[PDB]
Amino acid sequence: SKLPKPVQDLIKMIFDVESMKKAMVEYEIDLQKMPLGKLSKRQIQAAYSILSEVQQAVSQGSSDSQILDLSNRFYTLIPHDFGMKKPPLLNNADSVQAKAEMLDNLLDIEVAYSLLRGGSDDSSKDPIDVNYEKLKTDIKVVDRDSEEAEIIRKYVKNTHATTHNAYDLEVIDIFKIEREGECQRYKPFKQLHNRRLLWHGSRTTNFAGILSQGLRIAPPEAPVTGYMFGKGIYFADMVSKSANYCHTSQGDPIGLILLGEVALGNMYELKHASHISKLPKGKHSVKGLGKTTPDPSANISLDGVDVPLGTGISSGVNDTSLLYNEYIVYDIAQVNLKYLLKLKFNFK
Template sequence: VEEKSRSLAKSSSIKSKLHPLLQALLEFICDLESMKDAMVEFEIDVKKMPLGKLSKRQIQDAYSVLAHLSKRLSKIDQLDQGFILGESNRFYTLIPHDFGMKVPPLLDNPEIIKNKLKMLEDLREIELAYNILKQDLEADVNPLDQHYRQLRTQLQPMDTNSEEFSRIKQYVKLTHGSTHSSYTLEVVAVFDVERAEEKARYDEFSAGRHNRQLLWHGSRRTNWVGIL
């Protein structure tokens, strides 16, 4: 599967029918190596739990452990080191970590539990993306075109001369945080997104309302396939 994801368009003799910007986007988000790198960054033991062995059930069970711990930690009079140690070990059994020579940290405070919850959210998106990308590819269709079809989402590069594109560029410029002064952002491309059946669901609740707004949602690129 990893071989399929590497330079997908370039490795195929079949020419892609997609817009060049869309091809570039798919190359960027359909990258299994970046997903593996994210797991290493999370200090996950990728030898015990490689990308292909990550399961939805594992992640859900790990969520349950964290929820149980969080509930107990909120009640100071019920803190029990034995309980915390047992649940921490259970979590690390479900989601194997590699801390090198260090002792695995106890899940004994709200901050570390919050971080592990965020990690599980990212793992859930990675697991979903992997299951999409691992599907067998047809020999007579460009791999990027096939992955685009698997998304079941319409992606259309926005006209750079459109009012909406200009507005988004302005938003990026005017809302750049003062604490992030070490870099600047440049809008290279914007895509209109229409997910399967989403418009019908939206129209059902938006009739008569005129307060639709554009909102930012930032996420790791390894999450984008799952989000789309």
């Protein structure tokens, strides 16, 4: 009752058990054999190791049956329902990427559903108040006419890529967030140079986890797929690049995005896929060099932090496998989430 409507609107939204169920069904998971309440960490941890066993087998060149065994084992562990359609073999990069994408969501779906059942949920206290406390995060509404509000709205407007011409982004709510202990954790990197305010798009069902446990790196068991520069935390300077990872449908055009203080330091600027996790001496990050970059001449120093809100301009790089820039850090302590934005997607 006692929280601002937008802050409340956000809790019910991120803690929706019905939205969690929707995602499971969209991954073709058998909710009769694998309900929301059966999902466990060691089960998803096991599901990662099988995908890593699959990608190793395919690489080492295995036999139909031994490769088929891991496909059966994965589905036996994570009950799937394909109806009358035959179960698709997990024996290729597209097959593993799609299952690895699912586990990421299922990981943050578990972390969220566990929170909901956890705690001394009694009766007198408003469901919102109860759940907002469980995130261990100070969520405060940013005023419409504030300084930061104009900066954040300039950033959204100017960094929307010409390629991403399928929606128009519309800002609904801006929240100044501060995760419990994050500043104490980030403290060793606050002094570091090249600190930037960057974007991070993610599915709505993952935010109760993102605000609960912060932005995280894939576990060692996870297959090394989907991401261009290894297991690390990925950001964009282009809003629409991150906004794409909200997976907003025409029926559900409401999604959430992030702005985190990423302590980049000396960036190991690459142009083509390169798995590392272990950076080179003196480097603190990786920068995926894109053909299009926000105007470096139009940089802003909001709170002594670099904000590349420049209009989309082409960088002088053409020998690169990347359309737009991306940034990766391999230490979760180098991130410090500042804002959470509620965005409307207006499809053409």
